[PDB]
Design an enzyme around this catalytic site. Sequence first.
Site, PDB file in Angstrom:
ATOM      1  N   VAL A  10      40.021  40.397  47.924  1.00 30.14           N
ATOM      2  CA  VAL A  10      41.016  41.292  47.346  1.00 30.14           C
ATOM      3  C   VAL A  10      40.695  41.677  45.911  1.00 30.14           C
ATOM      4  CG1 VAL A  10      42.915  40.670  48.866  1.00 30.14           C
ATOM      5  CG2 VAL A  10      42.417  39.258  46.867  1.00 30.14           C
ATOM      6  N   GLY A  11      39.544  41.261  45.388  1.00 30.57           N
ATOM      7  CA  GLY A  11      39.155  41.599  44.031  1.00 30.57           C
ATOM      8  C   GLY A  11      37.719  41.218  43.732  1.00 30.57           C
ATOM      9  N   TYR A  15      34.325  38.745  36.287  1.00 31.57           N
ATOM     10  CA  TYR A  15      34.934  37.421  36.370  1.00 31.57           C
ATOM     11  C   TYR A  15      34.479  36.626  37.586  1.00 31.57           C
ATOM     12  CZ  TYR A  15      37.698  40.499  39.304  1.00 31.57           C
ATOM     13  OH  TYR A  15      38.093  41.440  40.227  1.00 31.57           O
ATOM     14  N   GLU A  17      35.128  36.755  41.925  1.00 33.28           N
ATOM     15  CA  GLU A  17      35.814  37.430  43.016  1.00 33.28           C
ATOM     16  C   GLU A  17      37.058  36.641  43.395  1.00 33.28           C
ATOM     17  OE1 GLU A  17      32.864  37.835  46.007  1.00 33.28           O
ATOM     18  OE2 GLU A  17      32.324  35.705  46.033  1.00 33.28           O
ATOM     19  N   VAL A  18      38.056  37.358  43.903  1.00 31.14           N
ATOM     20  CA  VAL A  18      39.311  36.770  44.354  1.00 31.14           C
ATOM     21  C   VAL A  18      39.441  37.016  45.848  1.00 31.14           C
ATOM     22  CG1 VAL A  18      41.817  36.815  44.189  1.00 31.14           C
ATOM     23  CG2 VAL A  18      40.431  37.009  42.115  1.00 31.14           C
ATOM     24  N   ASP A 132      44.340  38.018  26.837  1.00 31.86           N
ATOM     25  CA  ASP A 132      43.798  39.027  27.745  1.00 31.86           C
ATOM     26  C   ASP A 132      44.914  39.653  28.570  1.00 31.86           C
ATOM     27  OD1 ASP A 132      41.813  40.647  28.728  1.00 31.86           O
ATOM     28  OD2 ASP A 132      41.182  39.234  30.299  1.00 31.86           O
TER      29      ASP A 132
END
EC number: 2.7.11.30
Length: 292
Positions: A10-11, A15, A17-18, A132
């Site tokens: 989903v991302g 950073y 990945e999610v 952030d």
Amino acid sequence: ARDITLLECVGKGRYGEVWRGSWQGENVAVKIFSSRDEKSWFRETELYNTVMLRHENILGFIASDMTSRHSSTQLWLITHYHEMGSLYDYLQLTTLDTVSCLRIVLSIASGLAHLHIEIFGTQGKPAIAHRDLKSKNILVKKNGQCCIADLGLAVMHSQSTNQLNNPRVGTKRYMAPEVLDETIQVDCFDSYKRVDIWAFGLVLWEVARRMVSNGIVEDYKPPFYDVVPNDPSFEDMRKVVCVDQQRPNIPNRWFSDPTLTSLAKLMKECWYQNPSARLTALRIKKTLTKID
Ligand SMILES: CN1CCN(CCOc2cc(OC3CCOCC3)c3c(Nc4c(Cl)ccc5c4OCO5)ncnc3c2)CC1
Ligand SMILES: [K+]
């Protein structure tokens, strides 16, 4: 824990990945950190498992795991899943009314106020600055409330100690003027709380654009969409914010609405060039509560 079954991604970005995962029947979100972001994985893990960070408006911790062999490192952070995704994606297609708009902005200020405030006692917690804050690091819940998600760049301060980072970290589009022109007092913890407040005001603007009044509404645009390109450089941001003294434009139609009028006054008091003149998260919360 690798009892998790990684269903769909989903991302995906710098950073890591999610992933939406399944762990013992329930949905979970799994953030897979790069080996280059190991310090960020540990800082976020340590706030969750040592400070015991927990709040209705902060992404719910479940588990953290690290496995490291000679020539292999896997860094997993496991949290509650939120099928509505980031506020950024949510604002793309959704429009808001007065109730749902205030629920979004007040819940964000409630989570940010909980981060900032120091709590004493055995079950207390230090003061925390996020560093952030932006719409992509805020998730929306099914009830219409939001939680603050990404804690990798957080800094802490306890009055019981002299404990206290990174020079220019965070999305450049959301950087505060004292970060861009390098006048930020990096040795005062209150400087980082005020940098979070500047970012919060930018998110306030993003959300209020999508709130309908008098049958009118604005498309979603990022902050400073009209004066910088995509992936703007540190120099582009310094020219617009510090030199041209520019702030996101308030549509005239907001002033026909008393709710969008108060949010407009709230944004301005988050955008002062003088960081000491900006509101605190606690004052923003109380103001938003009175609006109801
Ligand atoms: C394609 N769409 C289908 C359905 N819907 C899914 C919901 O998407 C998410 C995305 C998450 O992370 C992204 C948020 C925006 O920036 C990129 C990643 C979720 C999330 N992320 C997360 C963050 Cl931001 C920080 C620490 C974490 C996290 O999970 C594990 O530990 N957490 C929970 N739910 C997410 C749902 C939309 C996509
Ligand atoms: K929940």
